[PDB]
Amino acid sequence: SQIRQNYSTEVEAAVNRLVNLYLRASYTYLSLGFYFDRDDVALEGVCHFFRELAEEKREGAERLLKMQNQRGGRALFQDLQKPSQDEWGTTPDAMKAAIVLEKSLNQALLDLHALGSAQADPHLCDFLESHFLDEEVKLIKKMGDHLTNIQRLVGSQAGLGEYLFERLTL
Amino acid sequence: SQIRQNYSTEVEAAVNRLVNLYLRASYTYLSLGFYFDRDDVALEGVCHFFRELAEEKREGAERLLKMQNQRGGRALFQDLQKPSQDEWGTTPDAMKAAIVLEKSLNQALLDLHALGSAQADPHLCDFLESHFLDEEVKLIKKMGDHLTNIQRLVGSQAGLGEYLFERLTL
Amino acid sequence: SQIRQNYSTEVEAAVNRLVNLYLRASYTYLSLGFYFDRDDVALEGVCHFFRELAEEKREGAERLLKMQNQRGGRALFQDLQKPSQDEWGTTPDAMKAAIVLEKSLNQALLDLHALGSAQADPHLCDFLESHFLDEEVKLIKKMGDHLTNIQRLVGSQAGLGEYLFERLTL
Amino acid sequence: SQIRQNYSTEVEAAVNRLVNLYLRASYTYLSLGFYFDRDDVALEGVCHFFRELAEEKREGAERLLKMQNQRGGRALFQDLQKPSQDEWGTTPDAMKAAIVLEKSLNQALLDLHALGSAQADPHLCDFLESHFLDEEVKLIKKMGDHLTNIQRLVGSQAGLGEYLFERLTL
Amino acid sequence: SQIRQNYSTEVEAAVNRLVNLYLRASYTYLSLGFYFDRDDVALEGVCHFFRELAEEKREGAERLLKMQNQRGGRALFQDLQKPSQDEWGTTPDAMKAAIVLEKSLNQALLDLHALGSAQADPHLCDFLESHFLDEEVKLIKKMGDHLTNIQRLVGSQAGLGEYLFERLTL
Ligand SMILES: [Cl-]
Ligand SMILES: [Cl-]
Ligand SMILES: [Cl-]
Ligand SMILES: [Cl-]
Ligand SMILES: [Cl-]
Ligand SMILES: [Cl-]
Ligand SMILES: [Cl-]
Ligand SMILES: [Cl-]
Ligand SMILES: [Cl-]
Ligand SMILES: [Cl-]
């Protein structure tokens, strides 16, 4: 506020909402990871994949929080809703759910960018472009590649396919 | 006996019984290992898995024997009964038998801990907690994870599954 | 007291008493050590053995004092009674006296652990198990081993035996 | 059996019996070792000597088991009889018992070699010569050397002698 | 002949015959190796396995030739018969043929050893034991292990099995 300049109340609010979305995505990935660590699921590669994503989404949230402070905005936290499932099914089910989650995060980033462009807030626009937009695109391409490979394998002989994917890709 | 302090005859006996159980488990794993080294079985990863467990159970027994002496108890050895099978079937059969064995060792440890708590023998209780209880829990989780993976694979195409498990997990 | 939680007045008092016992044991070992450094006794290995024990018991007391503060207890010091003997006789006399001392420390630890269990103070119980109970058991076994060796030698030819023990074991 | 060639049923059986003998010898040495670790015996060198022999006999058994599989024989395990004594007396008693044990193992090896020669099984004959016959001869010479030294010392002043042997030879 | 001592004409002849057998086995493995290098077979691991065996059998022959000269025997060479097949079928066909070949070499070694024992030629007997008998036993066990693994895989889905064996074992 002594520092705040060209930073709309609308962007400040939307940044707080995006923080909650990223933290919720982190929580979802935490749940996905520990599900694949269950003794009756036991796919270590899959567990590690989602646990790494939990960390990445938490880091995204922290970078948004840092930015909020840099611009003189005020962080406001809300409840983090529990993930949508207690059990996540097969690796394919999980990967499909993960792409859905990422596409919603990406649309939120795109919406925030559009708001920034409308508010003529180029720092916001740059911030998103530099740390979030390309990272999301890259992650969604990777998930799509994984989905294709999982699906190719899970004809057959689905158990064999899920094992091989976890062993040879993840 | 010049050193013996707070060490009941009941615990001393139960420690000797647990030594026999661990040595018997070592012997069982010795048999499992060499079975998987047979030219008509030939699963090296499986052989190495059980041979390593033979060594771990022998080391467990030696640590119990050391403790028995540290407390002024007297080691008493009994016959080691031969393992329950001469041939161990498939990798899954073997892993199922191994989890049964471990759960019996774990229950023996839990029983000994309960005896120690009842005799107010905190050194015994600590000893078990520090060297045995978490090791057993970790080993049983690993075996459960292996069982799940074996079972996933041994739909199909059981021969293919047993080969892949041995090559890619073990 | 701003920090104090689940820490009974009974345990706090017993911890202060155990500090005094450990400091007294340190003092006793200080006296034992310097006795064996006398020109008319002159058993350097024996002197070093007890001087090292003096240091270990002092360190035990300091760890109890640190814990007392960590839990929000208040250290209260009492007089340290002088050791029970001015002259300690033979190496065997000294080692017998040392095992008596250790067994009393061990019983004090066991008593404090029982108090902690009754007060449902698991931090205390863990603290004792981790730093004191196994250390005492190990030390008492060592002393017992030394006693046996001394006694074996001090048939004969007692002077020869006391010399050889000091030279070849200590 | 796809691999088995020039390997008689008689040799296969005798190899299984020799495995049991070696494992039993390992168990005996385990008992001897822990006896000398007792606080009322306390001869560390003696304990280490027998504990090392326990390991060597176990390794002998494992090499026989490996060979059995290499030749297409089938390992069959029997109960391991408990050692013949619960308490082993003096170092001399123990060493005398150890030479008795070794001479029985050596005679078993010699008997198996004679069977191999009669069955015209030169691989067996070589196997024994290369890993077992000279090792046994060397070990029996060492034990004989130790026996002589113990006996020389245990005139006197037996306690002094047992101490010095343990300190200066073992 | 200035050097020849205790070396029968019968052993000298049998050594020359064994040289021819080893060279023929080398030639067979040369053919097996290049068959698996064909563009319409294309199993590199299988090719390398047999090419390495070609080299080992050639080295065996050279060691027999060296020995023949050391004993004052005279090397006599015969035609090397072409291998029994121009095309070797599947990996399993090839491995079955290889075990047949090895068992014939092993029986030749055993026969030569029996001749040496009958002629009281212990140098020959030692020579065979040290460089040939255990090597053959080890190689036949390995081939048997490979055969079992191939057979396990070549249910299914034989093409998949042959590929996986070559990729993951060889
Ligand atoms: Cl991880
Ligand atoms: Cl930046
Ligand atoms: Cl191994
Ligand atoms: Cl420990
Ligand atoms: Cl000192
Ligand atoms: Cl601590
Ligand atoms: Cl040792
Ligand atoms: Cl060897
Ligand atoms: Cl090559
Ligand atoms: Cl040579």
Curated annotation (Swiss-Prot), chains A, B, C, D, E:
GO biological process: intracellular iron ion homeostasis; iron ion transport
Residues annotated to bind Fe cation: 52, 55-56, 59, 62
GO cellular component: autolysosome; autophagosome; cytoplasm; cytoplasmic vesicle; ferritin complex
PROSITE patterns reported for this sequence: FERRITIN_1, FERRITIN_2, FERRITIN_LIKE
Residue ranges occupied by any Ferritin-like diiron domain in the UniProt entry: 5-154
UniProt-annotated location(s): Cytoplasmic vesicle, Autophagosome; Cytoplasm; Autolysosome
Cytoplasm listed as a keyword: yes
CDD domains, sorted: Ferritin
UniProt cross-references to InterPro entries, sorted A to Z: Ferritin (IPR001519), Ferritin-like (IPR012347), Ferritin-like_diiron (IPR009040), Ferritin-like_SF (IPR009078), Ferritin_CS (IPR014034), Ferritin_DPS_dom (IPR008331)
Pfam families on file: Ferritin (PF00210)
GO MF terms, alphabetically ordered: ferric iron binding; ferrous iron binding; iron ion binding
Keywords assigned: Acetylation, Cytoplasm, Cytoplasmic vesicle, Iron, Iron storage, Lysosome, Metal-binding
Residue ranges of the region described as Catalytic site for iron oxidation: 52-59
Extra remark: In horse spleen the light chain is the major chain.
Family statement: Belongs to the ferritin family.
Self-association and partners: Oligomer of 24 subunits. There are two types of subunits: L (light) chain and H (heavy) chain. The major chain can be light or heavy, depending on the species and tissue type. The functional molecule forms a roughly spherical shell with a diameter of 12 nm and contains a central cavity into which the insoluble mineral iron core is deposited. Interacts with NCOA4.
Matching PANTHER family: FERRITIN, FERRITIN LIGHT CHAIN
Function field: Stores iron in a soluble, non-toxic, readily available form. Important for iron homeostasis. Iron is taken up in the ferrous form and deposited as ferric hydroxides after oxidation. Also plays a role in delivery of iron to cells. Mediates iron uptake in capsule cells of the developing kidney. Delivery to lysosomes by the cargo receptor NCOA4 for autophagic degradation and release or iron.
The protein, known as: Ferritin light chain
Organism field: Equus caballus (Horse)
Phylogenetic placement of the source organism: Eukaryota, Metazoa, Chordata, Craniata, Vertebrata
